[PDB]
């Protein structure tokens, strides 16, 4: 999930974008 | 792009801005 | 009516707060 | 959608909740 | 509703949205 | 106070609402 | 003039920042 | 109230502070 | 057009998110 | 400046990035 | 004024509001 | 920097203001 990936760990703009519609 | 921990409402805002017209999906259960 | 972009920012924060663990989809123009 | 109803008129948390999954 | 820790400005925003026209009172000293 | 109750501990929508006017 | 609901969100954040430990009341229409 | 003065016109932190308790 | 003050709040949040470690200057009317 | 372009019209993160240092 | 830790976007918003028309400079690398 | 001063440590309105243009 985006949380473990971006909150529990640091993520990039690209990684955040994997969760767009 | 910030290279820091994005949590809670901050992650949702980041999603809102990055995704734009594409829209996004958010589930805290992951 | 208001600037939809700014309003949207506030709407997603509200969804984050109210939906909780149910998550949600944000789709401006279905 | 939520924008269509909540940006023109004010929505309570209850109205916003209608849009949860 | 989110089932997480609400602190600082996040708590105030939650108060703002939950209370609505009722208005609210905020004291950090408690 | 709402802090010890909602920030130091997790609280519900109902609990947050106890602090409305 | 602006959308009062959105503006209010920003006003309470400002009150949180400036009032500090003095706390504050937010009453839209006294 | 603060809405009456700060939503129509821009308020500095000083003007906002007037509304603290 | 929109309320520039409120819009600005959202713009600086966007700059914070996108600029990251490069930092940025926020100058309304150069 | 960024206000001049992004408050009247909607700016993507890409357009906002143009204003980074 | 709040007497607490101001970090991330919260610090940027505090800068935005405190500085006003003066504008500000933000560098996370310090 | 403003981070070590205001995020890693608690700072005052005056301290935050040292970082204005
Ligand atoms: Cl936080
Ligand atoms: Cl706004
Ligand atoms: Zn935060
Ligand atoms: Zn806003």
UniProtKB/Swiss-Prot annotation, chains B, C, E, G, I, K:
Superkingdom of this protein's organism: Eukaryota
Protein name (record): Insulin B chain
Organism for this UniProt entry: Sus scrofa
Lineage summary: Eukaryota, Metazoa, Chordata, Craniata, Vertebrata
Residues of the full protein shown: 25 to 54 of 108
């Amino acid at each position: 999930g985006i949380v473990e990936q971006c909150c529990h760990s640091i993520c990039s703009l690209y990684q955040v974008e994997n969760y767009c519609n | 792009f910030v290279n820091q921990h994005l949590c809670g409402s901050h992650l949702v805002e980041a999603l809102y801005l990055v995704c734009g017209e594409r829209g996004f999906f958010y589930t805290p259960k992951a």
